[PDB]
Scaffold this active site. Structure first.
Site, PDB file in Angstrom:
ATOM      1  NE  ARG A   1       2.587  14.978   4.272  1.00 34.15           N
ATOM      2  CZ  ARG A   1       2.989  13.536   4.908  1.00 34.15           C
ATOM      3  NH1 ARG A   1       2.713  13.519   6.046  1.00 34.15           N
ATOM      4  NH2 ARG A   1       3.144  12.282   4.174  1.00 34.15           N
TER       5      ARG A   1
ATOM      6  CB  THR B   1       0.449  10.655   7.128  1.00 30.82           C
ATOM      7  OG1 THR B   1       1.965  10.949   7.284  1.00 30.82           O
ATOM      8  CG2 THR B   1      -0.003  11.423   5.923  1.00 30.82           C
TER       9      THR B   1
ATOM     10  CB  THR C   1       6.642  13.677  -2.932  1.00 32.53           C
ATOM     11  OG1 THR C   1       5.711  12.796  -3.609  1.00 32.53           O
ATOM     12  CG2 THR C   1       6.771  14.932  -3.838  1.00 32.53           C
TER      13      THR C   1
ATOM     14  CB  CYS D   1      -2.389   8.947  -1.174  1.00 32.90           C
ATOM     15  SG  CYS D   1      -0.973   9.651  -0.379  1.00 32.90           S
ATOM     16  CB  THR D   2       1.101  12.155  -3.887  1.00 36.39           C
ATOM     17  OG1 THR D   2       0.897  12.668  -2.614  1.00 36.39           O
ATOM     18  CG2 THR D   2       1.605  13.119  -4.972  1.00 36.39           C
TER      19      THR D   2
ATOM     20  CB  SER E   1      -0.967  -0.001   1.254  1.00 34.66           C
ATOM     21  OG  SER E   1      -0.288   0.255   2.266  1.00 34.66           O
TER      22      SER E   1
ATOM     23  CG  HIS F   1      -0.068  14.967   1.529  1.00 32.10           C
ATOM     24  ND1 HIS F   1      -0.345  14.361   2.671  1.00 32.10           N
ATOM     25  CD2 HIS F   1      -0.174  14.236   0.709  1.00 32.10           C
ATOM     26  CE1 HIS F   1      -0.796  13.146   2.415  1.00 32.10           C
ATOM     27  NE2 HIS F   1      -0.588  13.117   1.084  1.00 32.10           N
TER      28      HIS F   1
END
Ligand code: NAD
Ligand code: NAD
Ligand code: NAD
Ligand code: NAD
Ligand code: PHN
Ligand code: PHN
Ligand code: PHN
Ligand code: PHN
Lengths: 332, 332, 332, 332
Positions: free
Chosen positions: C231, C179, C208, C149-150, C119, C176
């Site tokens: 973030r 998390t 990223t 996700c990005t 994941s 973002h």
């Protein structure tokens, strides 16, 4: 007095700044197996909450050097293995959160440390709150506790209130900033399930020993106070909300008068007093243990009142740790 | 009953939603001079806190059409100029926050409304809490108040505890979400200085009439309860912390049983009961007035206890406004 | 296909929800050594971000029973010790965050899983984005990645724009949500120093691999895109800001038409399209990979444009994991 | 030079502190019809973001007295009615947000003010950015603009970059702290619908003129830059993200070298430079207009780069307003 710091966290790093800032504590050794030397530089110099260190910090010849003073850096998981004695660390600030019992905290004595100050409540080490019971410390005591941030805000207020009016019984809530034990999003948190919920999203009910622990620090209050906490989405500064029933009658203005008196005299620097229209940010980096908010409180009658007191939970407590060590040092 | 809404804000919109989610009540008109027809379509559709509306919303022919039903839209600053009668609005929810006295809310009577329900405490309009004193309403009352969100939380609980044990005296705190009266950064708030301080940054003490108001809604508790608030950086959901002294002894398990019994019978849907490890977000969009948190409270002894109860200040209250109107209508 | 989940965290729980909301996939086992059976009941039931589970969850007979279906629960740190085969787990979702390489994720093969879906991005497991290159999957692949996700946000958009206009070169930023890897207050993050700073306090630059990863998923864009992240203090939902230079001229209205056309046909459910005045909360629990925000982007000229696309990083991605598994299963 | 302040807000109050702190501006009059005199004391002394005024503040004989200097306090809604001349206010800082056109701002001249400095972009008054085009100011100009916080961060970076490599085209995003124009919960916000959504909950797309306005401040860049903003849940400090294409090739290290040079020489105090692992809080109360973040940027190639620059939007801009006034004063 020369001191070692075990766990260079929020309290470890701010106890270190408070130490530099007093004349009277020399930090000589730091152990933290999760923060290497160049990382220690960065974590000390930059602070989201309390701002950039006004001072100098660098790494040199394998030592952390703050304001020209060189500091031995250890990287041990087992405090039994830290060579404090060799480092010249007389007292140790046990600020990891993970060694709070006499037996666990006592491991620092094997590396040649003389005394340990546990930066939290202890199940069995004796607890002190400056301004309240520190004079009960004697030289036989090798392992002590500075109690909690919350106990340090409650106990001075309660001392003054009990001394003048008699506290029959009391119930305390602290509305408390988030700390490093909490989680950014809903996640695991052991047997304390609420504490894992997303810290920025939630008001979170939590346990606190602080009201009961005041009955240790002021024996006459033993079994007369308990309470709880709510964690809320601010990064620092907390408030105590004490609801108490009194023996002698006390008009609110007489409570104010007696707290102002105490803040001005024997509890100067520990218990503050204000009537200004303050909010939590107005106490950020405030060094008091407890500041009474005259305007925020409310009395139902002369025997039943709600008293409000502010505290910078990182910065106030950190300064108290230094103060206790100074006191201990002067009794040696 | 056909209903008009004055002030299509947090409460006005969420009352509208609650009305459509239950046919309990038909919304036929809305007035808000700061939100035009097209803009209402937007604000009703998308909600940061409670999510996107499940249903249809569009502008057709100068009306707002929700779920196929056309609603007449007005844009008047002066409530006396709104033609409620022409639109068929029998009852008017007064949810602007600026017309809370009888004299001001009464201006709706000018435009042809039959009765007004103020979505806040009133200095003089009689106040009702569903499940506590709503049966004291009678048809002689043209202008009523549904009290505050906090009062709706505190009252059902205080009723149960008083009915069964006798509240001698109590002090309340609500730790409360931020609202529209607050400010994003430090700015003017007028006479209430703390309230103008940056909402996302601070724990902010604030005034509340809820505890006193409980003494109107529950006449036996007149003068026996007072309190204060802390505003904290969440967008919704709040919590009552009631510290009370009891006449008859009540073990905490007896309190739990009594409250649970109450949630299951007459106060079902109004007062909820839980033993789970809940935090504030678990009550987001929860329609109860009050949810007792068994695990979070604490007793000092059989006569001195701290009781904790959660409420969605926006959603619970909005559902209560609809319920009050349904009751009123049944009495006609 | 029967599925086991390793790491019952934000993604592991939300994959589980998505699986039950769609029978697309049957969850039969879950491993998480930091969350016991009773504690799983709690964490699955209550979710700060996405709300309380609509369905049933309880512990019976040492299993977790969701919607009547019993799930085998393991508590192993070492993925090699989980008996996936015994529990019937054919495919394993590897959502712990600490086993992202083929070598580490492969340990699930030891306990009898047939295939593993990581994941997160992988240094070496091949990465797939539903609607962009999922048809490149084939049965020779025992260990695959569903990318980040990005990447799932950026790729569908970059495909449409590239297919129709030719992306010469692009630079991406994602703003973002916070998390679980972040910290509540300034604390240790290891090698990634900015990431350890207080999450609720800061705008935090971060690294990223998404833009590069787009060049794997869309081979023609290899080496043509890079980027960074910020973030910021929200708990969920993020946004891509893609600044690109185009080969063929594209008027912004042509971009809108192309993207809208794409959302309505082949990328329906994956790439969404909106003209509304949306903000991040309007995408909370939204299952799209990517939602193009027509109003928010801006063109300098026919060849140089800034394109904006929203994604629920938790919920969109979790649904994509299920969709990828369904695809895999169809290929068997 | 003596100065009056119209609108004692975030910028009004911080321009006032910056003024006291320079040797060279004397604040002599303040007009704000929404903040009375004793309220002005409180709002000046306590600041959630920048901390308690280090200084003295009181009310005396109907004047605001800061550091012993007495200040005339006006309470006029219509700036045409403010008796500036009588007060001795030579220049006026128009910091209300509501008088930004020459015609509206020109009302201060009727009360005998000599020059107006509008604390924001103006549709028609000439705009200045210290370090970039302030020397284009001449004595004919009675009404000027200091541009925006964002234009002051972008323009110095862009000056340096264009000067050394040629900016062909550029697209800018600012990730921006919330301001007083935003709402605590979803509420009305005129024709700008996104700006009304709940500021603590959301990332919010917004318009900005700043990229276009740089083409006014540096005419060679006219029509070569545009951009947008995201508002996010922090109370202060913002970041510019400039994606630009260059004429001459520029390795990232050559960009760094040339920005460091500029920060050390002719843009000292205006453009800063860092390679530290900084986050937004590390710039709180930082007086620079723009600080380049070497580590945070990223280049795709020698002609296409993403550059990151930090700014304290309240404090940096406030200091620039003072600086402009000093410059203007010295040209008289
Ligand atoms: N934050 C507060 O407001 C506050 C106030 C008073 C007391 N305290 C107490 O102080 C203690 C620390 O709190 P904190 O907020 O600084 O936590 P923190 O998480 O910021 O700091 C803990 C530090 O200990 C280090 N550490 C962990 N295991 C270690 C080991 N085996 N050896 C050495 N270092 C180790 C961590 O790497 C970290 O740097 C706790 O007991 C806490 O209850 C906290
Ligand atoms: N938010 C809560 O938690 C809550 C709960 C219970 C009760 N209340 C009360 O309900 C009332 C509304 O609070 P809210 O939170 O919805 O505030 P809000 O600011 O969200 O809504 C008020 C609305 O009234 C409108 N308005 C202002 N002047 C008007 C006029 N002259 N005519 C018509 N409309 C006008 C505004 O445009 C806005 O849409 C207040 O009395 C408040 O105390 C709020
Ligand atoms: N949160 C998001 O937005 C998001 C989106 C896409 C992908 N991802 C990725 O998915 C993965 C999970 O992220 P998350 O946000 O759910 O994190 P998380 O921290 O919420 O969940 C991880 C879970 O794994 C568990 N765990 C840790 N060690 C384990 C072990 N040895 N065996 C089994 N379980 C173990 C933890 O107890 C926790 O429940 C990460 O790779 C992350 O990069 C996250
Ligand atoms: N906050 C920032 O970061 C920032 C940065 C640069 C420029 N600016 C600009 O500065 C201006 C003010 O911004 P701010 O953030 O201080 O706003 P603010 O809302 O904090 O302050 C505005 C002040 O003006 C007062 N005011 C309103 N109408 C008035 C009148 N008719 N006469 C006198 N005073 C009046 C208000 O009472 C308030 O105290 C705006 O044009 C804004 O765009 C803001
Ligand atoms: C050696 C080192 N530090 C100390 C002493 C001796 C004695 C007293 C004392 C009191 C306060 C702080 N440090 C010391
Ligand atoms: C009030 C304030 N500061 C103190 C005391 C009481 C008592 C002891 C002490 C020892 C060292 C430093 N400060 C204090
Ligand atoms: C009167 C008052 N202030 C000033 C002057 C004359 C002249 C120059 C000048 C330059 C900077 C700041 N103030 C002044
Ligand atoms: C760089 C930094 N500070 C300045 C300038 C350039 C130019 C003019 C000026 C005038 C007054 C105060 N500071 C500056």
């Amino acid at each position: 007095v020369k001191v070692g710091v075990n766990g260079f966290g929020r309290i470890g790093r701010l106890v270190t700044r408070a130490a530099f800032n007093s004349g009277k504590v020399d930090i000589v050794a730091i152990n933290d197996p999760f923060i290497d030397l160049h990382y220690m530089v960065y974590m000390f110099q930059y602070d989201s909450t309390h701002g950039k260190f006004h001072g100098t910090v660098k790494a040199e010849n394998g030592k952390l050097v703050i304001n020209g003073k060189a500091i031995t850096i250890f990287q041990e998981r087992d405090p039994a293995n830290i060579k404090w004695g060799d480092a010249g660390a007389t007292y140790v600030v046990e600020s990891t959160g993970v060694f709070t019992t006499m037996e666990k905290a006592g491991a620092h004595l094997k590396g040649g440390a003389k005394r340990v100050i546990i930066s939290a409540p202890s199940a069995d080490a004796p607890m002190f709150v400056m301004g309240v019971n520190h004079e009960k410390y004697d030289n036989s005591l090798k392992i002590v506790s500075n109690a909690s941030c919350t106990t340090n805000c409650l106990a001075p207020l309660a001392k003054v209130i009990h001394d003048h009016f008699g506290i029959v019984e009391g119930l305390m809530t602290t509305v408390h900033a988030i700390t490093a034990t909490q989680k950014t999003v809903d996640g695991p948190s052991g047997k304390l399930w609420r504490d894992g919920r997303g810290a920025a999203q939630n008001i979170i009910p939590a346990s606190t020993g602080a009201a009961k622990a005041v009955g240790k620090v002021i024996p006459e209050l033993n079994g007369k106070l308990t309470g709880m906490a709510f964690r809320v989405p601010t990064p620092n500064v907390s408030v105590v909300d004490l609801t108490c029933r009194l023996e002698k009658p006390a008009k609110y203005d007489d409570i104010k008068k007696v707290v102002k008196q105490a803040s001005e005299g024997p509890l100067k620097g520990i218990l503050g007093y204000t009537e200004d229209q303050v909010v939590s940010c107005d106490f950020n980096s405030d060094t008091h243990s407890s500041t009474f908010d005259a305007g925020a409180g409310i009395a139902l009658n002369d025997h039943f009142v709600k008293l409000i007191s502010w505290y910078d939970n990182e910065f106030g407590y950190s300064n108290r740790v230094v103060d206790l060590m100074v006191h201990m040092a002067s009794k040696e």
